[PDB]
Design a protein around this ligand. Structure first.
Ligand SMILES: Cc1cn([C@H]2CCCN([C@H](CC(C)C)c3ccc(C(=O)O)c(Oc4cccc(Cl)c4)c3F)C2)c(=O)[nH]c1=O
Ligand SMILES: Cc1cn([C@H]2CCCN([C@H](CC(C)C)c3ccc(C(=O)O)c(Oc4cccc(Cl)c4)c3F)C2)c(=O)[nH]c1=O
Lengths: 195, 193
């Protein structure tokens, strides 16, 4: 079994990369692809609260992402890993660390303590970071507040990866998506075949 | 202003005590009574998930009580404290410590760390613990009785590590005496500013 998460800002082609990597891995491994809330009822109700929120307090928002993370983890991820599957998860703890923690300014260490209560030791075995430059990312997406937030998410991810190098594998997401797909696929197959 | 919370297991007389204390305090203070979620829209939505739910993971449950707590604190408690109000709050951080942390077996320090993220340093000015014995509290199935006992054991462990804001009121005595001891404790804190 393997728990592999995918991280990156918007415009990193992450969703495109995970779907293509999944289509290729299914030919050789027992694997599922998922994301939060991913159909878990309580998680879906939590998502409705997040999306209906008008200037919601950032700590309440972080706790709701963490509660959706726990429900998804318990009802989808853990049973799949128990069945010996490879689980590909599009966004996990690092997304709360970069977004709520760094970019929103709650602090990475505080949001990490919250998410450690939620995941209870279940950190990914490997995290694929789609390292896109702010300028390339922006072009894949297409005001000043949105550009500044996108750059702060990217800075956040750099800070997280600097302190946890062993868990992460950075993939150059500035290259064409065919190459991003290929480098990500190779990184995963290398980790999996070493187990 | 003052942020006063009330803690205790079931059968402690808490709802009666808060209401009677409110009626006495309102003569000298601008006081409000509240409880989480307390009408805060996001908190009300969260409460529906906790109630209209089935066999929910205990950690997920703890995070939802913590999220409702933050919403009620930021949109209701803090604005009332800014107005100079005495806020009488029925259950706060210590209920999560006793119920989620001790009784449900998540762990007290793990639940404390979650709730410190939610309250972000806003601990009560005073906390009234309505100290009722498991036997007296039971009178006021086996699983529910063991859980009620676990809750009291939980509350006992919290005060064994905290004494400043914590004020234990003997809740085994008749309700008139419980109200008097509570009111007198609050007024002694309030008069000392
Ligand atoms: C997993 C995760 C994602 N994000 C971001 C990633 C980029 C997109 N955004 C938006 C934020 C909203 C407020 C505009 C987003 C986009 C789509 C959905 C969507 O699902 O349509 C969404 O709802 C979710 C997604 C995951 C979990 C939950 Cl509880 C809600 C969402 F928050 C979430 C965080 O900030 N923290 C996290 O832990
Ligand atoms: C504040 C608090 C209370 N409780 C208990 C105290 C005793 C009553 N119970 C029940 C549990 C449910 C699952 C049957 C309870 C009873 C009534 C309501 C009710 O309000 O009808 C309720 O809903 C709430 C209350 C506070 C916050 C939230 Cl999110 C939901 C509730 F959880 C909550 C906890 O376990 N943790 C806390 O942080």
């Amino acid at each position: 079994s393997a728990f592999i998460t995918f991280e990156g800002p918007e415009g990193s082609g992450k969703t495109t990369v995970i779907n293509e990597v999944y289509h290729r891995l299914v030919k050789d491994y027992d694997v599922i692809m998922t994301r939060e809330p991913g159909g878990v009822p309580t998680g879906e109700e939590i998502r409705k609260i997040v999306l209906e929120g008008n200037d919601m307090d950032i700590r309440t928002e972080a706790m709701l992402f963490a509660a959706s993370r726990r429900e998804h983890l318990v009802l989808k991820v853990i049973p799949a890993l128990k069945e010996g599957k490879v689980v590909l998860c599009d966004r996990y703890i690092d997304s709360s660390l970069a977004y709520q923690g760094y970019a929103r300014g709650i602090g990475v260490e505080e949001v990490r303590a919250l998410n450690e209560f939620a995941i209870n030791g279940l950190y990914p075995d490997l995290t694929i970071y789609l390292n896109v430059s702010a300028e390339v990312g922006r072009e894949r997406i297409i005001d000043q507040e949105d550009l500044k937030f996108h750059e702060k998410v990217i800075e956040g991810y750099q800070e997280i990866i600097h302190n946890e190098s062993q868990r992460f594998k950075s993939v150059n997401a500035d290259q064409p998506l065919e190459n991003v797909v290929e480098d990500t696929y190779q990184t995963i197959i290398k980790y999996l075949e070493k187990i």
